[PDB]
């Protein structure tokens, strides 16, 4: 007697349609206000697919309210009318396009994170995805005679649950490409989590995304599996399936990728704070040449990585550059990655205002002596200033305790009192996580992890990477490269609304 | 009352953090320097690149456009204000001359004519060079703080300079002595700009406060309780009734030079507003921040 006989069906259709429409409207209104342009436009396309699904839900609600209690007489008319397969095409298009865009976005994140593509390629793949959605949603519609109104099988007009000509298509779209899409999403986030750990909020966020995807699409896989296994499921069950669990993406993707991310809160806080023709063609040719030149220049500039060098005058600042010159400026290559380490120290000792011009630098390598205790206090002061600086609050600092041998024989000699310059060493015990280094006295370990301790206590009062180095070991370049890879990981996660 | 001007053009050519810019004399052909060691000439009206000079230093700190428009200056920590000639008979732009006579970073070096250029260095000095000889024609000392900015008077007979000494002093181009000493600031000075009349100059420090000094001497101040963040670049309009300061609130703040009120806020930038510029005719405002965008405001 009614298309949605149960009152629960009607009330939640209206609720979920309103939620989907409002979320996608908010995403459209808020996305241009917030890193990466291609990711933003892909989010816009996903929002467009979600609001198309919301429009489908709204039009199904409107058709249901059009015939309330008289749906029995008009049942076969809507069975044969073009409106039913039209809205079925629209729903299938929305679901398929949203799924494909999600896979594209997640694969882009995977290829940027696990292995650390241009505006034209982004437009090409996005338009190709939309056209693929149109073709998939319209091939049953184009061959109307052969497909025997494929979309209009059930009264909901979304053909989830008829003869061979329909079931093959149904299992080709849902069991065929949607399950593979699920595999891609779950494998991609598993690989991202494994690469990040090998902090805690990232795992929680990934769990929420995969849980939303599962709760929306693994029941679809289940019901398609039972339908293909000749297990009887009446059409009212797939009516609830379309009504409740299918629009989950259309409700949650607008609030997940956009509303629950940190840059959304940053934008909210920002808003709160605020509240003849030959000459033209020659110029066009020059613009094309300059644009390809800047394409090559952008590839080159992102290929290299800046590495600021800092420390004390007595510190081993210059010997670090001198050591990897054997391996101001110095360009080197580690694992086919180009690094740009420079030690600007020929200027005055004043450094408050020329240090502001190194904020795109991947890492500030604070290498400082471990032996001179007055210079150790100076290092504590400089590290405090670096950590608490506004523009260095987003820059990772690679802490290097150079001349560890100088400190080792200086405390073995016992000529100078550590307590006189730092009394806390009289009441300090070695950390439990101290690295096992045989052949050296516990006094050296105590003092060395002690100076690590005032460095790290100031740091905890971007991330700091403390290390011990000398002038003998040549492995420091590899450790700097690993730390740079980690910084790449964190800031790439920052660009993709995750961290 | 209110000045609500938006991003009329967006210049997305730059691919790194933009550090300095300078308008040309003909109110077009912006020079813009970025962290990729790139120095790009734009046509403001049609938004098209005509020259892309590869700089020696990626982290360039200052760029300048000559008044004649044939030469462009590049400067940074490398103690050189390199001069490049654009009009080449061979048809390809190439380096022309280098000026290496300092031990501190040239935070800003701006031209007077095709031959002589004044530089403000990081070793507490300024220098007028003549690029025909290559010798530092005149030296300027007397600042006990790291010099960060300088502004050139319209008649180019005086140039004012602001340092980390929290003081701003004039220097004569020829004689080379500081007549007037102004010390009314509170923290390090980061930008300075002559008033269009040439009888005054505004100066933006890191104390989240701008001060307009007049040479008849603290003369005027621009600050508020809500702003607690410094100033990066200060620029004046053609008539001088309007001022724009590149605060590090990730957006420009437009002040009134005479009323010291909140004329407006130019939002739209993601990072520190590195440099600001206003045309000779007062038509357009070019803003360069670290989002690699030249935002034009009209």
């Amino acid at each position: 007697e009614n298309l949605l006989a149960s009152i629960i069906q009607r009330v939640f259709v209206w609720v979920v349609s309103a939620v989907t429409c409002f979320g996608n409207i908010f995403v459209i209104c808020m996305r241009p206000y917030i890193e990466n342009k291609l990711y933003a436009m892909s989010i816009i396309s996903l929002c467009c697919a979600d609001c198309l699904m919301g429009i489908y839900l709204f039009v199904i609600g409107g058709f249901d309210l059009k015939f309330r209690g008289e749906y029995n007489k008009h049942a076969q008319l809507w069975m044969e009318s073009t409106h039913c397969q039209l809205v079925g095409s629209l729903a299938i298009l929305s679901t398929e396009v949203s799924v494909l865009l999600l896979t594209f976005l997640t694969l882009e994140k995977y290829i940027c994170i696990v292995y650390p593509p241009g505006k034209c390629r982004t437009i090409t793949v996005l338009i190709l995805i939309w056209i693929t959605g149109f073709i998939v949603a319209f091939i049953p519609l184009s061959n109307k005679e052969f497909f025997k109104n494929y979309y209009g099988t059930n009264g909901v007009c979304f053909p989830l649950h008829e003869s061979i000509g329909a079931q093959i298509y149904s299992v080709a779209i849902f069991l065929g490409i949607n399950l593979a899409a699920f595999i891609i999403i779950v494998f991609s986030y598993g690989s991202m989590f494994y690469s990040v750990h090998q902090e805690m909020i990232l795992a929680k966020r990934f769990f929420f995304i995969v849980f939303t995807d599962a709760l929306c699409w693994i029941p679809i896989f289940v019901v398609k599996f039972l339908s293909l296994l000749q297990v009887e499921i009446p059409g009212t069950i797939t009516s609830w399936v379309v009504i409740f669990i299918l629009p989950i993406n259309s409700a949650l993707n607008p609030i997940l990728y956009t509303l629950t991310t940190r840059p959304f809160k940053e934008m909210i806080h920002r808003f709160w704070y605020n509240y003849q023709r030959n000459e033209e063609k020659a110029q066009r040719e020059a613009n094309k040449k300059i644009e390809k030149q800047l394409q090559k220049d952008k590839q080159v500039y992102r290929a290299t990585h800046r590495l600021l060098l800092l420390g004390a005058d007595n510190s081993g600042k210059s010997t670090i550059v001198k050591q990897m010159r054997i391996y101001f400026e110095t360009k080197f290559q580690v694992d086919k990655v180009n690094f740009h380490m420079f030690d600007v120290g020929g200027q005055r000792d004043e450094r408050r205002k020329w240090i502001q011009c190194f904020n795109d630098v991947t890492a500030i390598i604070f290498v400082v002596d471990s032996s001179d205790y007055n210079r150790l206090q100076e290092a504590l002061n400089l590290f405090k200033s670096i950590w608490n600086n506004r523009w260095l609050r987003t820059i990772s600092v690679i802490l290097f305790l150079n001349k560890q041998d100088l400190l080792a024989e200086k405390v073995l000699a016992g000529k100078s009192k550590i307590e006189d310059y730092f009394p806390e060493f009289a009441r300090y015990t070695t950390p439990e996580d101290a690295t096992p280094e045989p052949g050296e006295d516990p006094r050296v370990t105590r003092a060395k992890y002690f100076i690590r301790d005032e460095f790290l206590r100031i740091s905890t009062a971007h991330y700091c990477y403390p290390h011990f180095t000398c002038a003998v070991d040549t492995e420091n370049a590899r450790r700097i490269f690993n730390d740079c890879r980690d910084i790449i990981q964190r800031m790439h996660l920052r660009q993709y609304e995750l961290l | 009352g209110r000045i609500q001007m938006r991003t009329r053009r967006t210049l997305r050519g730059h691919l790194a953090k933009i550090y300095a810019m300078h308008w040309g004399t003909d109110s077009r052909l912006l020079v813009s320097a970025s962290q990729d060691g790139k120095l790009i000439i734009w046509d403001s009206y049609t938004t098209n690149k005509v020259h892309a000079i590869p700089l020696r230093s990626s982290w360039v700190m200052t760029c300048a456009y000559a008044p004649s428009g044939n030469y462009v200056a590049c400067g940074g920590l490398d103690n050189i204000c390199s001069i490049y000639n654009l009009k080449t008979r061979e048809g390809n732009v190439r380096v022309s001359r280098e000026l290496a006579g300092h031990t501190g970073y040239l935070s800003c070096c701006r031209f007077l004519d095709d031959n002589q250029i004044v530089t403000s260095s990081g070793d507490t000095t300024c220098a007028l060079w003549d690029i025909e000889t290559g010798q530092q024609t005149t030296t300027f000392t007397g600042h006990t703080g790291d010099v960060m900015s300088l502004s050139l008077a319209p008649d180019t007979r005086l140039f004012v300079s602001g340092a980390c000494d929290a003081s701003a002093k004039l220097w004569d181009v020829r004689e080379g002595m500081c007549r007037q000493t102004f010390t009314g600031h509170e923290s390090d000075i980061n930008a300075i700009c002559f008033f269009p009349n040439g009888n005054a100059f505004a100066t933006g420090s890191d104390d989240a406060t701008c001060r307009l000094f007049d040479l008849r001497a603290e003369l005027m101040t621009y600050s508020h309780d809500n702003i607690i963040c410094g100033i990066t670049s200060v620029s004046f309009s053609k008539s001088g009734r309007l001022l724009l300061a590149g605060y590090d609130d990730f957006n420009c703040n437009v002040w009134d030079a005479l009323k010291a009120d909140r004329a407006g806020v130019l939002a739209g930038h993601d990072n520190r507003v590195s440099c600001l510029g206003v045309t000779d005719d007062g038509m357009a405002v070019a803003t360069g921040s670290w989002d690699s965008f030249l935002k034009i405001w009209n």
Partner: nanobody
Amino acid sequence: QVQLQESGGGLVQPGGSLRLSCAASGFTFSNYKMNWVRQAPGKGLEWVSDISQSGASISYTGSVKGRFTISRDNAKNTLYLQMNSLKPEDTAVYYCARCPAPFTRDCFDVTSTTYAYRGQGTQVTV
């Protein structure tokens, strides 16, 4: 004109007491984290004490932690260093340092020279 004036001094027997007053003129004392520095003969500059804007966070160098302490008289816009039982080896000129930027904690006050935010200082002979 940023002015820092050091008051209080005189030769003190080892283990004695004294007061050091850093008076700030031309700027607000509250917004800036402050430091006490001292230059010994034959030695470079070294700031020995730092105190935050509201006085909540106070840190001392090891030669200062157990001997003598610092305080802010923000109403009098001045810094008190309460010299108490100083070792005889620390005969030095006591400079006062204001951090370069307001509303922040980054400070570079150990410049060899040309740091505009340090007073002439007074010579304490202990």
